[PDB]
Amino acid sequence: MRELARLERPEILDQYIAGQNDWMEIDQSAVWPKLTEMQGGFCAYCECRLNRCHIEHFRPRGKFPALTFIWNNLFGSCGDSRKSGGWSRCGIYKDNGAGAYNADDLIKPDEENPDDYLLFLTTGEVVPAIGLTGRALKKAQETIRVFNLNGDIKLFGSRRTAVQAIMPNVEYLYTLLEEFDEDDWNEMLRDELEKIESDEYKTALKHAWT
Amino acid sequence: REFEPNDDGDQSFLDSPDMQTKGSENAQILEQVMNVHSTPPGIAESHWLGNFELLLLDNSGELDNHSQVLYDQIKAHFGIDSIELKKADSLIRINKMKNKLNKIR
Amino acid sequence: TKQYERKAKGGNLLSAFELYQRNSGEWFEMCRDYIQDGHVDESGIFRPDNAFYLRRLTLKDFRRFSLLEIKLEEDLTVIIGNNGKGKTSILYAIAKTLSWFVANILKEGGSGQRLSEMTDIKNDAEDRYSDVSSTFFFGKGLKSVPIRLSRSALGTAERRDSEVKPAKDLADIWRVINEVNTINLPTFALYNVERSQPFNRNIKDNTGRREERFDAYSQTLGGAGRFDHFVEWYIYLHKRTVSDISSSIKELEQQVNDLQRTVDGGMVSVKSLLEQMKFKLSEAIERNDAVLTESVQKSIVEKAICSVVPSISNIWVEMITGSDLVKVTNDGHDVTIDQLSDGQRVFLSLVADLARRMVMLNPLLENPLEGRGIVLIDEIELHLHPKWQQEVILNLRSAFPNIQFIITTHSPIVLSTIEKRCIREFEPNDDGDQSFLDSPDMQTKGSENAQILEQVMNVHSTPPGIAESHWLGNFELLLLDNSGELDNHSQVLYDQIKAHFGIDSIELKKADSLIRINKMKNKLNKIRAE
Amino acid sequence: RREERFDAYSQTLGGAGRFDHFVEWYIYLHKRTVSSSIKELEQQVNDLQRTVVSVKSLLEQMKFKLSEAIERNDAAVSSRVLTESVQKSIVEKAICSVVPSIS
Amino acid sequence: SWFVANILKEGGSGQRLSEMTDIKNDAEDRYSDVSSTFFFGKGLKSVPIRLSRSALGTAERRDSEVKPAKDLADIWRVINEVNTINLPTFALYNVERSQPFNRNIKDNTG
RNA sequence: UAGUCGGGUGAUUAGCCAGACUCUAACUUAUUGAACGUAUU
Ligand SMILES: Nc1ncnc2c1ncn2[C@@H]1O[C@H](COP(=O)(O)OP(=O)(O)O)[C@@H](O)[C@H]1O
């Protein structure tokens, strides 16, 4: 889960008004170019490469009908509702699979940096970060539970494999901390960290590298 | 043609998997197509490496008494030449080096 | 005799029994205590003081084996190998030996099974006979019970004799002591690949009664169980539970109480039904009021089935259509047994049959499934999805904690749940002259399936007869041949990998990793050269 | 299969009067007759379904009764038939009245 | 089964759906349909077949539509009668294929 | 951990205490005969 940088609000949300208008009315191909600029063709929550994808209301339309055409509330999530059932992470699982949840107790990735809450183990679990109690522990635990960031085997395995592929390199780089001077070695680490923005599960790969 | 795992009989079409299976590793097919963990989740020993890593990260990368005990358990159970022990060794080496860098800074 | 007295007072079971037979009180009690004494451990599980298990098996000129010795675990032994290594042969040999105990528990001087003169002698054996030698253990007072089954080839003039008297002698103790005062009895069962049969509800057995205790030994080593007998027995249990009025009164009292709560909750439509049930309850109470062992037996078996069989949450008998039907809740849906998938039915059949037999043979135990016995299962993974394979051994051992299980498997998933000490593994290039079976070098319990395949089962992670299976290996070799630089040939193959496996494939990520590490290694090499 | 009125003419002129047929039939009728409007029954089934562990046996009985009522409703004028309870009573009376020394 | 029956005999009947086992337990319409479409070269791009079975209570009978199977099978049968042709193989191997071998090899009845 | 060996205690074939061992790996056996130990002479 990455810290996201929301910037500019699209024209089409100004036209439609919450209460009177329905969500199905809007042209969704208008919305995606701004989300794709923000998120980079990757999911908000799990950081898979988007191929089957839908617009996700962070606070849902059922519970919160006032929050409908609001630019804060939209995110590009993995999986498609229309195509098929049995998608079991992220936006679809938030609604159906995770029944009862406090919408307050979830990490909104545009507002908050998730790196304070979530730690990514090289074994490919995601866990509460070292030293959290009370509310920050509760937010870490519920984000993991509701978006199903361990329970989806397709996700868990795909993340575990991605990290384990680079672990020869991470081992090898830090052995050459001895021989190289700082300006060479820091250029090497910055280059790697540059490459993994274009890669999938980038937060998991960062925690391996840094 | 694969059925969805949580099909309650109302699936209209059987579909192809997303991953190419021909020439792929069996462990990948287990997880990505058959929806089964490559390591048995109902065995405690299957979690030891994860737990070991968490302990190492809690103690700024140094083997404390608790991490050493678990290391010895991993060694005793899986063996000196096991892939699991090699992973543990790797974790120690990497985390020690990361911590040394942090101290220099 | 004074000699027998000394041995018996030293704790020898056979001597105590001999003294009992010659003086036909003290000696009887010794024998009965030896069989019945035990304790409940820290985990709340009953443990007999004197365990019964197979210790060792030796096969001489039997089928594929010239001379083979196997040492078995007291709890669980798993035999692995390729097809045709003789895994089934081993279980067959054991089952025939166990048949001698079963025959003699049923009948004094009963005859067990025999080795086949047509099929069981090794084809190229110079001596034209075969031997199956077994040694069993029954506590420290009877450390060795040796049995030998033997058979000479058809048309050989010299005939080789079996030695079965020790089996008979032990089985006699069980039979005779039981006749005087009831004891718990050992369960012996074989489940081979024949357990996969089509189900027929209608074909009913008229060859004995199903509620008689020793029916538990009926066809127990035939290989299929008798799931038909289970269904009959279970319906019988149901009828008896319905018939005794106090449970019916208790059930009716519970139904009246539930209906009264519904009426108090505002549902006035069910008031007519409540009045009818209150009348039925009053009538039942008025009829002559007096826990059924049958009710407890039924509950034990239901719990066992539901605990071991993952898709089954409930099992019950319905009579209301006018015929007796066993129904189950399978994956949240109420279905008949005939509606179950073959995988579910076959596994249900195994557990149901085993539970029935244990309940019948262990009437004095609080949990009858904590009885003693030896159970043989061929191809435990038969018809099971990988998900189920990951639970099957754990569930069986939890439900039947004192049984010795001897199992065969082809499943790495099953092996990932079992300790290496329990595994017995054929050498790959055996050809039936290996003397002793051994455990694998690698620890299997908790290990990755890919590793088990390669290290234990000698199977490559990728299918060797597919070209694409070699591409990443070849790609790595090309990188190493061209001093780590991506040449025309390496680029072509990279593109092929990308095109075939896809952009987010494991294979491509590994290739990318190789490129990155090799580039970094080369940069180091250049810095060192300068 | 279910039974139908004109089964009375099956094997009537050779094959009638076999003890095994009787016993099977009689036990069947007994099991069915051990223990209302369709709409009322539909409402009762719906109420019992909403309540549903101890009432599950009662729900199954009521569902059976509803199905039978619908079937009888759906069944034709030509196949009109007395309740299984009445049938049983008449046959029992006939046997006891006719057969020497069975009361 | 409908192709096989009609290759063997004119107007041969294949197998039917079971009223007891093949109908979905909670089917509102109380019938079951198995619809199949076969291909036989560009000359015969679509051979549709439907097997149907209604539940016991029978508000209306749903009949199977098997005529195209019969028509195609007739072509194979009739042409083969005049001049030997190659014929299609149809086989099912279910889990019942796992069964013991009887050694008692029978009569050459022919 | 388990199994095994056994110096001591113990109205003593039990139990308890102490110390030790670990090739994949004991299962205590049979007389009037033979041999051995003891007794007899
Ligand atoms: N009498 C015999 N002589 C020689 N080889 C035999 C004899 N009987 C069986 N075999 C061989 O033994 C094997 C039987 O395998 P089986 O016992 O079923 O083991 P598995 O179940 O592991 O395949 C086959 O390779 C077969 O050729």
Ligand SMILES: [Mg+2]
């Ligand atoms: Mg002597």
Ligand SMILES: [Zn+2]
């Ligand atoms: Zn996602």
